[PDB]
Amino acid sequence: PSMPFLKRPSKLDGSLPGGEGCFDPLGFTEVFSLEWLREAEIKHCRVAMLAVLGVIAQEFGTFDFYNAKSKLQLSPDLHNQFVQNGALQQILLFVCAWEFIVGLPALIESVNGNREPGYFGFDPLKLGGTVGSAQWKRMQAGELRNGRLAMIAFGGFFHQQLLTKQGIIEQLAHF
Amino acid sequence: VLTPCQQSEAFHKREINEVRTLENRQANYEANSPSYLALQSQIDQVHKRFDKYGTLLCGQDGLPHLITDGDWRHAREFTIPALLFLYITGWIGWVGRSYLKYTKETKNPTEQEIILDVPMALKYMLSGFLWPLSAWQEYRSGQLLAKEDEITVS
Amino acid sequence: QVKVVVDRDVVPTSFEKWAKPGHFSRSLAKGPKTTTWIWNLHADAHDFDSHTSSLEEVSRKIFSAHFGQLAIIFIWLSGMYFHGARFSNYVAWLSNPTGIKPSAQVVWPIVGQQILNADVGGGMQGIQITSGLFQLWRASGIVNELQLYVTALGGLGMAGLMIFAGWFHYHKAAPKLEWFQNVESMLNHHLAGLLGLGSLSWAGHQIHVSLPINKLLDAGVAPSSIPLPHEFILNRNLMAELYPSFQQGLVPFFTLNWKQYSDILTFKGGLSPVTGGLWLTDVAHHHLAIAVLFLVAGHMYRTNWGIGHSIKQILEAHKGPLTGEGHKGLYEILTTSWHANLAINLAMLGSLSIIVAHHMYAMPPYPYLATDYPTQLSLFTHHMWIGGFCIVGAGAHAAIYMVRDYSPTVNFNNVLDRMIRHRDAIISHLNWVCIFLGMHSFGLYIHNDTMRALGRAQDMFSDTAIQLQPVFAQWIQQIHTLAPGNTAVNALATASYAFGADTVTVGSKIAMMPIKLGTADFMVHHIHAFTIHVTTLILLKGVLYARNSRLIPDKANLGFRFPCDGPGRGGTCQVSAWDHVFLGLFWMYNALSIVIFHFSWKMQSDVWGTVTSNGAISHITGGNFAQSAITINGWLRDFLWAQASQVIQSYGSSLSAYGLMFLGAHFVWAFSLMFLFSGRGYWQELIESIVWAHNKLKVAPAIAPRALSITQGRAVGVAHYLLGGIATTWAFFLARIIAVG
Amino acid sequence: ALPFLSKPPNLSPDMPGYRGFDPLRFSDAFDVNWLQEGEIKNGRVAMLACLHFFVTEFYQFPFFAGAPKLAGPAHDYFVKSGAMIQILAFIGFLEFLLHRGKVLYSDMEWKGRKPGELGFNPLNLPNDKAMRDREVNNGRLAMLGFAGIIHGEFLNGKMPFEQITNFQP
Amino acid sequence: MNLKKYLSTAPVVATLWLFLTAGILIELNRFFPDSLFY
Amino acid sequence: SALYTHHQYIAGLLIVGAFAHGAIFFIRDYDPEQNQDNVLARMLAHKEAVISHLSWVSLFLGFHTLGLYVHNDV
Ligand code: CLA
Numbered sequence A: 001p002s003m004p005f006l007k008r009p010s011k012l013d014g015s016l017p018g019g020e021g022c023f024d025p026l027g028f029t030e031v032f033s034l035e036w037l038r039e040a041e042i043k044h045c046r047v048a049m050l051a052v053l054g055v056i057a058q059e060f061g062t063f064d065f066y067n068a069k070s071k072l073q074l075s076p077d078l079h080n081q082f083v084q085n086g087a088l089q090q091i092l093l094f095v096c097a098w099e100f101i102v103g104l105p106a107l108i109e110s111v112n113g114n115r116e117p118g119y120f121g122f123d124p125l126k127l128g129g130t131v132g133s134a135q136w137k138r139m140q141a142g143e144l145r146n147g148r149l150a151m152i153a154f155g156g157f158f159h160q161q162l163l164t165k166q167g168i169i170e171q172l173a174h175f
Numbered sequence B: 001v002l003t004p005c006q007q008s009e010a011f012h013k014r015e016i017n018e019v020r021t022l023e024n025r026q027a028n029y030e031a032n033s034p035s036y037l038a039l040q041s042q043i044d045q046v047h048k049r050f051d052k053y054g055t056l057l058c059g060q061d062g063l064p065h066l067i068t069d070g071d072w073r074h075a076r077e078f079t080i081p082a083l084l085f086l087y088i089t090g091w092i093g094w095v096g097r098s099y100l101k102y103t104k105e106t107k108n109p110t111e112q113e114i115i116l117d118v119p120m121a122l123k124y125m126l127s128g129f130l131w132p133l134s135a136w137q138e139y140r141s142g143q144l145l146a147k148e149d150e151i152t153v154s
Numbered sequence C: 001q002v003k004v005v006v007d008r009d010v011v012p013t014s015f016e017k018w019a020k021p022g023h024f025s026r027s028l029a030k031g032p033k034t035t036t037w038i039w040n041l042h043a044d045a046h047d048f049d050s051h052t053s054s055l056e057e058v059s060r061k062i063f064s065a066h067f068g069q070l071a072i073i074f075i076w077l078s079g080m081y082f083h084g085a086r087f088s089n090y091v092a093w094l095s096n097p098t099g100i101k102p103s104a105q106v107v108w109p110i111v112g113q114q115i116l117n118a119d120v121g122g123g124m125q126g127i128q129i130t131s132g133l134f135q136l137w138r139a140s141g142i143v144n145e146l147q148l149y150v151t152a153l154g155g156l157g158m159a160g161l162m163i164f165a166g167w168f169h170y171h172k173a174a175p176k177l178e179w180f181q182n183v184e185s186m187l188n189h190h191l192a193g194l195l196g197l198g199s200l201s202w203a204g205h206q207i208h209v210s211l212p213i214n215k216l217l218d219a220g221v222a223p224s225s226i227p228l229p230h231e232f233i234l235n236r237n238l239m240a241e242l243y244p245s246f247q248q249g250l251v252p253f254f255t256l257n258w259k260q261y262s263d264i265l266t267f268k269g270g271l272s273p274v275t276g277g278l279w280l281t282d283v284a285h286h287h288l289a290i291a292v293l294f295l296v297a298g299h300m301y302r303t304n305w306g307i308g309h310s311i312k313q314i315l316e317a318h319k320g321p322l323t324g325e326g327h328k329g330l331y332e333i334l335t336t337s338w339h340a341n342l343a344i345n346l347a348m349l350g351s352l353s354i355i356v357a358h359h360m361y362a363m364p365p366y367p368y369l370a371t372d373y374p375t376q377l378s379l380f381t382h383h384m385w386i387g388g389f390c391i392v393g394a395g396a397h398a399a400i401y402m403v404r405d406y407s408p409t410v411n412f413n414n415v416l417d418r419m420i421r422h423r424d425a426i427i428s429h430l431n432w433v434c435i436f437l438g439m440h441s442f443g444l445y446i447h448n449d450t451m452r453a454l455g456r457a458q459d460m461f462s463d464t465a466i467q468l469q470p471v472f473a474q475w476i477q478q479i480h481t482l483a484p485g486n487t488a489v490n491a492l493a494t495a496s497y498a499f500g501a502d503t504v505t506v507g508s509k510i511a512m513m514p515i516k517l518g519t520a521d522f523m524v525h526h527i528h529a530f531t532i533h534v535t536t537l538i539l540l541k542g543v544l545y546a547r548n549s550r551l552i553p554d555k556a557n558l559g560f561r562f563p564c565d566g567p568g569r570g571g572t573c574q575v576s577a578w579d580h581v582f583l584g585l586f587w588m589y590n591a592l593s594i595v596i597f598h599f600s601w602k603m604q605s606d607v608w609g610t611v612t613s614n615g616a617i618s619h620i621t622g623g624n625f626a627q628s629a630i631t632i633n634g635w636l637r638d639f640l641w642a643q644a645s646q647v648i649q650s651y652g653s654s655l656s657a658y659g660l661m662f663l664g665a666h667f668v669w670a671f672s673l674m675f676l677f678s679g680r681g682y683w684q685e686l687i688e689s690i691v692w693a694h695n696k697l698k699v700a701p702a703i704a705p706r707a708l709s710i711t712q713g714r715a716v717g718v719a720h721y722l723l724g725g726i727a728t729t730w731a732f733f734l735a736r737i738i739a740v741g
Numbered sequence D: 001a002l003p004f005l006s007k008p009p010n011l012s013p014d015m016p017g018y019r020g021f022d023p024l025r026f027s028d029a030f031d032v033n034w035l036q037e038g039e040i041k042n043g044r045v046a047m048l049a050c051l052h053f054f055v056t057e058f059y060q061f062p063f064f065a066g067a068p069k070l071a072g073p074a075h076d077y078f079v080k081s082g083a084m085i086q087i088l089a090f091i092g093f094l095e096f097l098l099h100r101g102k103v104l105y106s107d108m109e110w111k112g113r114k115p116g117e118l119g120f121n122p123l124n125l126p127n128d129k130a131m132r133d134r135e136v137n138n139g140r141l142a143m144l145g146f147a148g149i150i151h152g153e154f155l156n157g158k159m160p161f162e163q164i165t166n167f168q169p
Numbered sequence E: 001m002n003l004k005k006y007l008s009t010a011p012v013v014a015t016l017w018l019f020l021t022a023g024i025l026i027e028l029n030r031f032f033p034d035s036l037f038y
Numbered sequence F: 001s002a003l004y005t006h007h008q009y010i011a012g013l014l015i016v017g018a019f020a021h022g023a024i025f026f027i028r029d030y031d032p033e034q035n036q037d038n039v040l041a042r043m044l045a046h047k048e049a050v051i052s053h054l055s056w057v058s059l060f061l062g063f064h065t066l067g068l069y070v071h072n073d074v
């Protein structure tokens, strides 16, 4: 088939940035129109890369003035040390701006099919910010793959709690 | 006889009755209970509720009556929400009249009342604010009323 | 034969036709030149058998709409599990159920209505549940709030599968009619797959969740030392202590040594006197009996393998001589029209719901259900009213089949139209039975009314007066007393305590008492026989005279919702098959109003109430039925006046919302009457006399303001008569028994 | 201007204050010229209002107030002191002459190419040039930080000017 | 494109508007409860 | 308590008789050619304003008794 897999030759995709192939084993791109799922994939991969760099960069031990972390999960100490400061409310609220103001009509550009549904502009780079053919696709695959490994790797960075109850640096100090 | 309400005795008996009767529910919970905090805020909403009726006229029942003469000592009871209310439904009436005399001359007026032209609707929604001297200036123009519309036999 | 033939990518999923209201009907996409276009937009919104005659497109529309209904039901049940999770005192209720009144909904604190938050114990207030969800959850074995949050989450997930399901089955994979008229397979999968695997897998839940948990709660363990339901399946050693038959595994099952499963499964009946509900051993054994018996029942329909029946060769073989042709034709009747199937399924669904109501008062199946009487009351009452309305839908949709989808060619001399050949002899003997039962069911109340009013109480129909002891009900009730030793041989206790032995007291509250039926209960049963025969008179008159009456010999040409024919024949107002459904809804309100008034007053005099020491008895009304149900002054005084005292004195207290739903539901009731008595020939030029006052000020509405149509203008009178009249009894019942139970 | 192709609404690029920004397409259905005149008028009156929150220093306290740098119930202080109704009368006596049609969406007085009334310009060194383009920003920044003053009165509640040096919560 | 035309119909605008005025009254009766003056 | 209620129900019955025979007068007894633009023909001319304003005051009182009783009762 067109897939480097069992069999489904080009169900609806095939030109998307799968450099190793188009994966798609289950019937989502059968009926979901694929532009919605692409905007969801890219938005999840961006926010998951922010999540994993959040967990690691916080596990390098930095606070203005707060408690000892011992974790970056488990809501009261970390999360509701932050909420009771009256502090995460705005860091949610500005994203409540961002998605409704510049993500919702952006998603309307993901309605009509005139977007390439990532693309919030945003290349503040010289000598390497190619919007064209080569580096846009092979770097968009970089954002895509590092975002997917950010999704799963953030999955493990959450789920090392039961036999650990410690930091992931302390998980590296354990076997 | 309309006593001033801040010194009516049976009125203050209703104060003692609702504060204490509502406090009978407060005798179930501990000092940090959210229910108990809600009845703290509720007792606040009873003492404020009764101190903010200090200029009404609660008669022999201890219940705050009103006055609709426009005495100007009781204008805050009725005539000020009267003028306020007639402003609000003169707004609504003027918006509805202006919008209907828009869509009376469109392509498909039957479709215009199902599917509101939110362009022209929210044009008139806001534009009917100065309706006393817009109806007074359309009424002098011979445009507010009509003449020789439908009627039955005789 | 059997195969799956499904069109893919049928209807585009654009929002384009939302901008054309009334796109669906070619008789209605003209646009509103009148306001009657508005209301006909909604009454024709689900005439799926009246958009287009093509049964394929209709059948796609309905089968996709079902998933919308199940989407709303899963949103609703996920609402109940989340309101049980976040808002309820269920974890506190699980500690002591007989003390803490059940509540979920915690009213937002705005002006005054914070007084509706009833202090129901559990350290948290809110308006009290009478739906009895907590008794369903203790039977389910839900321990802490996490299973309620998770099951609400799965409720939303199944709601998403139903929205995406119906979207997927109208638009981008929608089946052919050959898929729909595969009815041997539809029964073959509902009798087995839906109901069979439902009851079997539910027996799996009850055995591996509810039996260990509601053994631990029957011992009285707080829900902290109880392990997870989960943690009973990882090892049998947590269940072999509770039931030692789990130690033997499934080996006594496959060796047919089913004596060994007497611990898990049994046939006891009665009620567990600790929890006041059924023994869940009996209930799990019960669902295994529905399991094997329905899974056997599924395999009687030949689909692909030439093994089983078809419906055709069954129905054609019942060619009895008094019908002549036999059932030749019904398989073509019931596989081409949907209103016929809706008549049957609504009739059996509603009557099943009444059966549900009776089997929930007299065999209370949930733990601590008969100890909080409002949940005991209203779960009787509510399944009566959907138990009622769904019957009238039968009388609607058996009428509609006779009007719309009837066809005399396929339906010639069979069992169906041979009724219509003597429908005068049907309706005439319903007419005689209605008058005979009306005299002998209500004239007894006027009789005892006068004899008590004339002083001659010896001439009444009391206990002491001319007795009318119901002989047959007392006799077969005595057979049910003599059940568990004689004929139900392997039983231990009776089928219920509404039949036999001494009552069940659970926390000084009477679970079930042996109901005595004497000489007043007789006459209320003849009320019920009467008002069931009147609705059967109107709803068989609405089906047999649905198509060609001898008054109007073309109703099939006029339609189903026509108002009338005219003033000719001396006036033929309210003559359609719809109009008999219009009357069957009022008589529904009558028949069920006196079913529940029979319930909620005989079971406040002969069952419910409290007990004191030395086994003493104390009902809520205190035995005040048989001396007082025989009249109507005793009825209206001792029930509708005396039981109002806890509804009417409810102001200032937490029941006061019912005191608002008592008055306003009177309002809506009387507000119905304006639509019933008047007619649109008044309102149309009353309205047009107001249209003069808009044309004078140029506020002429472009959509021309007609009055309501006749069938609408009476349909709204029914729909306020039932909301007002039903919500009066709703707030009267729940305001009555919460102040006691 | 706005990069993800969402920028051909009912608006026009040669309009003053333009930097290509209507994500929620308010230019549809809301009469872009009237939205422009509301932006200009909100910018100028918020501009003067934050100029009151700039010249809350000791200068020009002429005999009536005696309440320096309050910014909260100072509104209530002159509801109590009277003559705040009177400035609605005076502003009404302006807005008879300024707009002359004075109805919000019905009959907007579009005659002179620009949302600016009667040509209030006695100095008149610039005309309606691209100075318009640098008026609107000097209104827009005058809007937002104006809120930043009053919210500094809301939850900080300390002082308008005394956040800037080394004063942080 | 036509979704806003569905959001411009009579009941949808009537609920997005009566929901809004109902929100004006409910939010204006938490903030200022028991308002019998003025 | 019975004389008052007696004469009030008889009072309402006889008003409704006066208007019922009013309508019988306007159907089976009315001649608008002997009543050429008469006071009665004037009444039938502005009957639209009459019924619109009766419907107005009846609507106003029905939203301002029932409004105040449901207010006081809530
Ligand atoms: C377009 C708005 C509008 C306007 C200006 C009027 C104006 C009038 N109506 Mg009215 N009316 C309206 C809509 C309107 N109506 C609607 C929609 C209905 C159906 C419910 C009625 C039903 C009605 C009756 C039954 C009667 C009047 C009467 C009257 C007159 C007396 C004032 C009164 O009591 O109002 C009555 C007000 C109501 C019954 C309720 C208010 C109506 C709506 C809810 C408020 C307007 C909002 C409107 C929907 C906004 C649409 C435009 C917007 C979307 C842009 C007055 C000329 C009376 C009359 O003839 O007196 C001379 C009379 O008896 N009206």
Ligand code: CLA
Residues within 6 Å of the ligand: C063, C066, C067, C070, C179, C180, C182, C183, C185, C186, C189, C190, C192, C193, C194
């Ligand atoms: C054994 C398989 C099976 C099961 C479990 C069901 C179950 C159901 N059918 Mg159904 N059906 C089946 C086979 C089955 N059907 C077949 C073979 C046919 C063709 C002859 C039909 C034709 C049919 C029609 C025409 C209609 C139904 C309807 C219903 C629902 C009744 C409402 C109810 O009880 O709510 C209880 C609800 C539940 C218990 C939820 C169950 C949902 C889970 C996910 C099981 C569903 C299994 C599903 C078929 C898997 C799809 C396979 C696909 C992925 C390849 C119920 C969900 C009615 C309905 O409401 O439409 C939905 C309806 O109108 N069925």
Ligand code: CLA
Residues within 6 Å of the ligand: C431, C434, C435, C436, C437, C438, C439, C442, C443, C446, C534, C537, C538, C583, C586, C587
């Ligand atoms: C309280 C009001 C009331 C009463 C008494 C009835 C009574 C009746 N309705 Mg009914 N009905 C009512 C309201 C009422 N309806 C309303 C509101 C609706 C609106 C939906 C309907 C709609 C309706 C339909 C659609 C039908 C009926 C029918 C019937 C009859 C059923 C047969 C029966 O009971 O005979 C027994 C009679 C009684 C119980 C009445 C009391 C008579 C007493 C017991 C004996 C006689 C008293 C006395 C001795 C008279 C002689 C003395 C006198 C001459 C001085 C019955 C006469 C059915 C019908 O016409 O044929 C069966 C029918 O099809 N009704």
Ligand code: CLA
Residues within 6 Å of the ligand: C667, C668, C669, C670, C671, C672, C673, C674, C675, C676, C677, C678, C686, F055, F056, F058, F059, F060, F061, F062, F063, F066
């Ligand atoms: C409870 C019974 C009831 C009620 C309330 C009414 C009420 C009314 N009738 Mg009436 N009527 C009744 C029984 C009733 N009737 C009966 C039994 C008959 C004999 C058939 C008549 C015969 C009759 C005639 C012949 C006439 C009336 C008219 C009227 C209106 C008089 C004007 C007025 O007061 O408007 C005030 C409005 C009200 C009192 C309506 C109630 C307010 C509602 C409940 C609030 C709005 C809805 C609310 C928000 C709830 C929302 C519902 C939810 C689903 C969303 C009024 C609507 C006349 C008319 O049209 O006048 C203009 C007229 O000519 N009636």
Ligand SMILES: CC1=C(/C=C/C(C)=C/C=C/C(C)=C/C=C/C=C(C)/C=C/C=C(C)/C=C/C2=C[C@H](C)[C@H](O)CC2(C)C)C(C)(C)C[C@@H](O)C1
Residues within 6 Å of the ligand: A049, A050, A052, A053, A122, A123, A124, A125, A146, A147, A149, A150, A153, A155, A156, A157, A168, A171
């Ligand atoms: C790109 C964009 C910006 C940049 C925006 C950000 C800063 C770019 C950076 C993005 C980062 C965050 C990408 C993240 C990728 C995924 C991370 C690296 C996951 C790593 C996990 C790996 C290490 C596996 C980890 C196993 C996880 C497993 C659970 C066990 O525990 C063991 C263990 C730790 C080995 C600018 C501004 C800088 C430039 C602009 O032009 C555009």
Ligand SMILES: CC1=C(/C=C/C(C)=C/C=C/C(C)=C/C=C/C=C(C)/C=C/C=C(C)/C=C/C2=C(C)CCCC2(C)C)C(C)(C)CCC1
Residues within 6 Å of the ligand: F015, F018, F019, F021, F022, F023, F025
């Ligand atoms: C206090 C007083 C007074 C006053 C009073 C008055 C005078 C009142 C008025 C009122 C009145 C006095 C009114 C009247 C009423 C009446 C009525 C009630 C009417 C109506 C009518 C009817 C009912 C009918 C109708 C009709 C018709 C419909 C048709 C034809 C015509 C007719 C008319 C017949 C006086 C001054 C004495 C003095 C002092 C004391």
Ligand SMILES: CC1=C(C/C=C(\C)CCC[C@H](C)CCC[C@H](C)CCCC(C)C)C(=O)c2ccccc2C1=O
Residues within 6 Å of the ligand: C674, C675, C676, C678, C679, C680, C683, C706, C707, C708, C709, C710, C712, C713, C714, E014
């Ligand atoms: C009162 C009455 C009417 C009149 C009912 C009128 C026409 C309908 C009143 C309710 C409508 C829905 C009011 C219209 C209001 C619109 C919804 C817009 C208002 C703005 C908001 C509420 C959205 C009949 O048409 C009728 C017909 C046949 C027998 C009896 C009767 C009858 O008793």
